[PDB]
Symmetry: C2
Subunit: 233 residues, 2 copies
Amino acid sequence: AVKYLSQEEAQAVDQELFNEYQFSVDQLMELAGLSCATAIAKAYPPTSMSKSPPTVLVICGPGNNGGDGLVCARHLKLFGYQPTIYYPKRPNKPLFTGLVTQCQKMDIPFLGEMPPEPMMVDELYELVVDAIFGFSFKGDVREPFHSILSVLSGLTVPIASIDIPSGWDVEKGNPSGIQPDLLISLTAPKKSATHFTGRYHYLGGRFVPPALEKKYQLNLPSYPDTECVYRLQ
Amino acid sequence: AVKYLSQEEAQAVDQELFNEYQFSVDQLMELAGLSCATAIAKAYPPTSMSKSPPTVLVICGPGNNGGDGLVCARHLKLFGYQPTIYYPKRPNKPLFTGLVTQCQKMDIPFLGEMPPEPMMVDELYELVVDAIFGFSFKGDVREPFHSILSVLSGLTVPIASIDIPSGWDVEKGNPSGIQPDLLISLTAPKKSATHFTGRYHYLGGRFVPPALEKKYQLNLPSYPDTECVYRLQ
């Protein structure tokens, strides 16, 4: 079996990657975001969806998960989806301001407000991507995310979550949280993933040095040939 | 047909990407390098080669082409090749020092000297990747690259060149230059590509905004589904 990480382990691994291996944040974010866009294209391919091109709403939170989200939006566009982004709390750092410009000049729109009703999200967006919080989340969700999650709970279209379903406790999960249909675990799954019950669980972020994966006993599966995602069972 | 760029156009396009679209160098280098590793895995797949794992020598020059090369080495390793790098002139900038550390801690070795004979390269390396010079090359080749190219001319194993065959004039090419077997054109092919006669010509760097590709009339082909390379005919 593949190993499921504690928050401690995840922080240890991610820190190892940036200090010991000296990957820069935008290198891994680029790969992670591409992994997601690809997981999404394998689970919900365009041709298999009613709208042409198919519409996606990507909701990006205030840290790196949200960053993954912007990369993901951008690769989705190139793969033939029509994404829209909602990005309410934007850190003022070059990485993020660059990512925002990139999507903008690719004619990906940033909504000014979340559609206030589940029904409206449903009529406009055939898939929704949860790029709000990731593994370093803790404590009560504060605004505007409390009420964003609340809308999400009511949706009838599928949710795809990046790394962790936002709102779940990173290890123990959340019985009344959002229940996504696709979960892309980056690098390795996290212990909350044991509580996952959607249809699709993909593993992404094919950048793990063998030496890091051996040190932490990750038991990563073999990604087939040149693929950057793997479906778990 | 796809359009073949002048050095002017290529500089115009690459500058547009970094200023107008504000991609950072390490974002596009990451994608370009992955495109290459994938072009190489589609043209020379591991299972189809005598050594197990198959060995590759990646020769990196003193600018961004060489940077593409280090990214490429690194994805090749993950795809199941056993790459070795030769990187003689290393710019002292964080981007490059990071890339070097990454390969190092992935147990990719950097040779201290080029094997001095074509025969020796041939016996040790089943493929050689030319990541020396790209489209901003001009004037006489100076050391150590003059004599590196010279060894390359003598090889009997295949050469894969990134963007341009190093040593060719960027538009007019080079009748007595190296003659690679695979050419990965990044973003768009360059006019020297008309003088290409190897077996495989792939197009890589799937990151072109529609609006940039329309402005310059690139006539990029449709990359199939989620692929990051396309084979030209």
